[PDB]
Design an enzyme around this catalytic site. Sequence first.
Site, PDB file in Angstrom:
ATOM      1  N   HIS B  41       0.800  -1.219   0.000  1.00  0.00           N
ATOM      2  CA  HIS B  41       0.000   0.000   0.000  1.00  0.00           C
ATOM      3  C   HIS B  41       0.844   1.286   0.000  1.00  0.00           C
ATOM      4  O   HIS B  41       0.261   2.363  -0.115  1.00  0.00           O
ATOM      5  CB  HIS B  41      -1.057   0.010   1.111  1.00  0.00           C
ATOM      6  CG  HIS B  41      -0.545   0.126   2.518  1.00  0.00           C
ATOM      7  ND1 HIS B  41      -0.019   1.318   3.009  1.00  0.00           N
ATOM      8  CD2 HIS B  41      -0.658  -0.746   3.543  1.00  0.00           C
ATOM      9  CE1 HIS B  41       0.222   1.107   4.291  1.00  0.00           C
ATOM     10  NE2 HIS B  41      -0.128  -0.127   4.654  1.00  0.00           N
ATOM     11  N   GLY B 143       2.541   6.155  10.148  1.00  0.00           N
ATOM     12  CA  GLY B 143       3.957   6.048   9.824  1.00  0.00           C
ATOM     13  C   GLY B 143       4.585   4.740  10.287  1.00  0.00           C
ATOM     14  O   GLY B 143       5.725   4.441   9.925  1.00  0.00           O
ATOM     15  N   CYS B 145       3.584   1.655   9.539  1.00  0.00           N
ATOM     16  CA  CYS B 145       3.464   0.552   8.594  1.00  0.00           C
ATOM     17  C   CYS B 145       4.825   0.078   8.131  1.00  0.00           C
ATOM     18  O   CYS B 145       5.734   0.894   7.949  1.00  0.00           O
ATOM     19  CB  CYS B 145       2.588   0.945   7.420  1.00  0.00           C
ATOM     20  SG  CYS B 145       0.931   1.446   7.912  1.00  0.00           S
TER      21      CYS B 145
HETATM   22  O1  LIG Z   1      -4.219   1.737   8.666  1.00  0.00           O
HETATM   23  C1  LIG Z   1      -3.340   2.415   8.140  1.00  0.00           C
HETATM   24  C2  LIG Z   1      -3.383   2.768   6.666  1.00  0.00           C
HETATM   25  C3  LIG Z   1      -4.233   1.786   5.895  1.00  0.00           C
HETATM   26  C4  LIG Z   1      -5.567   2.072   5.624  1.00  0.00           C
HETATM   27  C5  LIG Z   1      -6.318   1.144   4.945  1.00  0.00           C
HETATM   28  F1  LIG Z   1      -7.622   1.437   4.689  1.00  0.00           F
HETATM   29  C6  LIG Z   1      -5.832  -0.068   4.523  1.00  0.00           C
HETATM   30  C7  LIG Z   1      -4.511  -0.315   4.809  1.00  0.00           C
HETATM   31  F2  LIG Z   1      -3.995  -1.523   4.461  1.00  0.00           F
HETATM   32  C8  LIG Z   1      -3.696   0.576   5.467  1.00  0.00           C
HETATM   33  N1  LIG Z   1      -2.278   2.919   8.808  1.00  0.00           N
HETATM   34  C9  LIG Z   1      -2.004   2.836  10.190  1.00  0.00           C
HETATM   35  C10 LIG Z   1      -1.405   1.738  10.806  1.00  0.00           C
HETATM   36  N2  LIG Z   1      -1.238   1.590  12.127  1.00  0.00           N
HETATM   37  C11 LIG Z   1      -1.663   2.568  12.911  1.00  0.00           C
HETATM   38  C12 LIG Z   1      -2.292   3.749  12.442  1.00  0.00           C
HETATM   39  C13 LIG Z   1      -2.777   4.765  13.302  1.00  0.00           C
HETATM   40  C14 LIG Z   1      -3.388   5.875  12.790  1.00  0.00           C
HETATM   41  C15 LIG Z   1      -3.536   6.033  11.419  1.00  0.00           C
HETATM   42  C16 LIG Z   1      -3.092   5.074  10.555  1.00  0.00           C
HETATM   43  C17 LIG Z   1      -2.462   3.895  11.036  1.00  0.00           C
END
Ligand SMILES: O=C(Cc1cc(F)cc(F)c1)Nc1cncc2ccccc12
Lengths: 306, 305
Positions: B41, B143, B145
């Site tokens: 992603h 950040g 990921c």
């Molecule tokens: O979840 C995602 C981005 C994402 C969105 C999606 F719809 C599908 C994905 F595979 C990845 N990033 C984050 C990871 N961990 C913690 C976080 C905390 C706050 C904000 C983002 C965070």
Amino acid sequence: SGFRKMAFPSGKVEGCMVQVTCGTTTLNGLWLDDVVYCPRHVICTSEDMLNPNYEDLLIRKSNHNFLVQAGNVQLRVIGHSMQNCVLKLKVDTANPKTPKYKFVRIQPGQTFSVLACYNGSPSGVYQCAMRPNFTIKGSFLNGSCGSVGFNIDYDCVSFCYMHHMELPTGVHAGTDLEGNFYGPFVDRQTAQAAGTDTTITVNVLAWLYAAVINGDRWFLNRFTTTLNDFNLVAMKYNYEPLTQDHVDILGPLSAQTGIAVLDMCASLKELLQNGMNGRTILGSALLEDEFTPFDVVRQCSGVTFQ
Amino acid sequence: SGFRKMAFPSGKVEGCMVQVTCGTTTLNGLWLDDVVYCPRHVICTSEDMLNPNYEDLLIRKSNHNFLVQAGNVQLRVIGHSMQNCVLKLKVDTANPKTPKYKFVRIQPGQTFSVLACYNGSPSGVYQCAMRPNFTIKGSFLNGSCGSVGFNIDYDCVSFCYMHHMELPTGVHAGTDLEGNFYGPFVDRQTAQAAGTDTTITVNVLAWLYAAVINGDRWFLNRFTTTLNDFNLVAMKYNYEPLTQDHVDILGPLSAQTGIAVLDMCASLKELLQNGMNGRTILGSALLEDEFTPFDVVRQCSGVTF
Ligand SMILES: O=C(Cc1cc(F)cc(F)c1)Nc1cncc2ccccc12
Ligand SMILES: O=C(Cc1cc(F)cc(F)c1)Nc1cncc2ccccc12
């Protein structure tokens, strides 16, 4: 989101761990530049431990009595000196893996990561707080002496603890890296006991702010309190007094969540009175006191959930 | 004495963390040999995440679109390919700090250390378990990921998790290092939820043995139970079933403490039905399930790496 007991990455400290042997005793040493720091009790036999005269025991040792092993390499000791309860062994090689570092003496309530080691090899890393009674509730077996506690805010390692001993209650005592013990402890087998421990109030408040930042507010109430009335209540549950310094330190978390420090104090007073009633706060059914205000700001988002 | 939630020493993994930037998105990568692994992603805009066609998005990228930084050194990407939900960026330089490693896929209940990273810089290390619902209760901000989970067995790092996303309840989802998600999750901005979770029974029993080894015995009782009666009680309290494999795995701890596995099950049954009655076990008022039997033996024996 989420809130975990998080340690600093230990790599910078792993590259400093060595094994120090003096006679039959083997423990850990911290190799920084051309000096290896280790507990001075490495020169003691089990019989010497009741009333050791470290100056007298040390004068009888030569550099070649200290065997220092770093990985599969034997370092040569070219000098030795004692500074308080730490032995400093000058070696003929500067550690190429020496990080940017400092020696800091911490105060009760401060947290740090411990890299537990045996035979100069790291076994695991965990997070600790220096208890108000100057002990740490570590996880240490025989051979762990010389394992260190540290923080790594930026790329600089601040070494704050060196492990020396386990007290009869299973809690731990040690020194700063200048060899000064935390607490009224001595590196002697004489009868010693941890004093009655108390909860680190400022840390519990910090962790309640962490819970609010992460979206939980169930424990808040419509009340406030004076600092003095809070301390009169909190002391009845063996909580440390909350000082005006602690109130000031919690200012940033108070501003981010919109909850005044004395309002959060009123919430804590109610939690102490009521318990959690089957609820949890950040996955805990007890009030957590091993996260400082600094830890919470570092771990949590700068945007409160709601 | 003492019992702490302990992570593996993270140094071997710290030497593999790099920053991966694609356009406006920056996340973490794992540099092993001449390949940098990261969540696929990284190539998506917010619009792309709504319904991404990763093959189509990737074909539009060249090697120079991926900026990889290992500390203050920019690595040159010489190839790129996708394996499931992970992007593999071939670089011209093999990581001189590559430890002995393997990619392993873990099972729910298994624990691992997470080295949380931001901008290719390790920030913290914590221990966690793959929940029975395939999420992890991590601590991750935007950040994070590409941060990885791992175990160490001797001098070999077994990488088992790469962080991809946060679910609405604040729990986390990711993949193994071959890009296969743990759980029924997809890397897309679409409504997804963590399923109802359960407690990892074998791990609670391991932690009760750890408490006994540490001198906490108040919960012991004279009783035993059958495996079937215990599992009836386990099902009632949303605890995972205890298998004969779990019983066998707890054999060494049972022999050391003199508390047979089914004898400890009767302690656990009483704790579930009656609670702790104001008492704690190893400083906890809840039954801890994020220590495996192996973690308990390892910590109580002082295994080094
Ligand atoms: O979840 C995602 C981005 C994402 C969105 C999606 F719809 C599908 C994905 F595979 C990845 N990033 C984050 C990871 N961990 C913690 C976080 C905390 C706050 C904000 C983002 C965070
Ligand atoms: O406490 C000592 C040795 C000692 C004794 C003394 F009287 C004074 C000292 F400075 C050092 N070693 C240990 C340290 N940590 C954990 C342990 C667990 C089990 C057995 C020993 C452990």
